[PDB]
């Protein structure tokens, strides 16, 4: 087994508000709303106490990033929807699906990355000139993993806890055999 559970750092979720939105008015009236229509086709609104960032699109869609837990993302999306109610749009909270759940952990031992790349070559792609980390792509579950020489592991691409977790204790036995001194 593994003595450490990974902790999450960012959860990306989508919401459909179910109505067309005028980004000009919501940029003029909401507090932290930044609309540069020729830098991005959405207005960027972020709020303090859940520390999330919303990307309000004109078609009523939504992307909420920066949340630490799924309940925190749900609460943040609720608060953004409540902002759109308080501004005067009929934006009903319809659906809420979390797409990307990235989590980090530290295995507390250095890893021999070239040996891991040579052994599991069908899953690993090591190019230390471009990026100083190893891209491990588990086939089951489909969680892309960033392995580093300091033992820091970045687990990326989950839809819930019950893929990233068993991704971590599926990668722990094949990381224990690659230890430096």
């Amino acid at each position: 087994t593994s003595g450490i559970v990974p902790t999450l750092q960012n959860i990306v979720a989508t919401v459909t508000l179910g109505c067309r939105l005028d980004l000009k008015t919501v940029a003029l009236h909401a507090r932290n709303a930044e609309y540069n229509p020729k830098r991005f086709a959405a207005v960027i609104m972020r709020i303090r106490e859940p520390k999330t960032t919303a990307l309000i699109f004109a078609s009523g869609k939504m992307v909420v990033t920066g949340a630490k837990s799924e309940d925190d993302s749900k609460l943040a999306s609720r608060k953004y929807a409540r902002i759109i109610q308080k501004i005067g749009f009929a934006a009903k909270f319809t659906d809420f699906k979390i797409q990307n759940i990235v989590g980090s952990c530290d295995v507390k031992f250095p890893i021999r990355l070239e040996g891991l790349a040579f052994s599991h070559g069908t899953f690993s792609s090591y190019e230390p000139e471009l990026f100083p980390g190893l891209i491990y792509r588990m086939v089951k579950p489909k969680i892309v993993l960033l392995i580093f020489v300091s033992g820091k592991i970045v687990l990326t691409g989950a839809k819930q806890r019950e893929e990233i977790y068993q991704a971590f204790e599926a990668i722990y036995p094949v990381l224990s055999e690659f230890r430096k001194m």
């Binding site: 000009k24 940029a27 003029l28 909401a30 507090r31 932290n32 709303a33 930044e34 609309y35 540069n36 207005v43």
Partner: protein
């Protein structure tokens, strides 16, 4: 044309408070008022960057920030600024800025 901010400044609101009396007295027309405000904005756009030599830097904590219609709005509070040194403590400060690209 150029950007339109400076009526919110002291000279600008003082100028419109001066000109509304002559509007009431009929001494200035509406088109004349619009073009005198436009030329005042052009004048304060041109002379504010050439024959002045002071500097100001602002450090603090921003509460509300916004960017719509190519203007940047800030509300920074508990902020202290430096002139050219002499330091000034501001409980709440508002920043309105416009892009360097020429309008129209």
């Amino acid at each position: 044309g150029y950007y339109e901010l400076y009526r919110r400044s002291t000279i600008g609101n003082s100028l419109v408070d001066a000109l509304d009396t002559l509007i009431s007295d009929g001494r200035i027309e509406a088109s004349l008022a619009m073009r005198v405000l436009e030329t005042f904005d052009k004048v304060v756009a041109e002379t504010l960057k050439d024959n002045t030599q002071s500097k100001l830097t602002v450090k603090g904590n921003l509460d509300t920030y916004g960017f719509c219609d190519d203007v940047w709005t800030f509300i920074v509070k508990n902020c202290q600024v430096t002139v050219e040194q002499s330091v000034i403590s501001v409980d709440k400060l508002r920043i309105v800025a416009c892009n360097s690209k020429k309008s129209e």
